[PDB]
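Hi team,

Below is the intake form for actophorin from Acanthamoeba castellanii. Please confirm the fields before the structure is written into the shared record.

FORM ID: S-0412
PROTEIN: actophorin
ORGANISM: Acanthamoeba castellanii
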Amino acid sequence: GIAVSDDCVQKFNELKLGHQHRYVTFKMNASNTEVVVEHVGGPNATYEDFKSQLPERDCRYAIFDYEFQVDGGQRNKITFILWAPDSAPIKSKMMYTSTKDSIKKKLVGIQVEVQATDAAEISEDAVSERAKK
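The structure came back. Fields below:
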């Protein structure tokens, strides 16, 4: 089984506990033996910053502390996203898919999960819409 790096937990914790990051992206390491942190989005990074950097032909995971000015205040939703574009190789797909539960259970505190397999699914509308699911 692919191991989740504890650094994946530390960064998720900095976001969840300290609001230190807008989002965190994760990818497998070189040996595909552990998922490691890839991109630490700071508090002012936009959803666009997160999105534009997603590999079109490779998978990734992400926590996006999606923010709102909505009814019951200004809300924050810790959204875990599995990015698995249909154009990724089967090996990449298989790996990310096969290891999603571990990262999800390691990341105690997720609030919304979404799976995006294309441009429209990873769009800001798809995600923002589901963020207040």
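SUMMARY LINE: The two ends are 31 Å apart (CA to CA).

Thanks, M.
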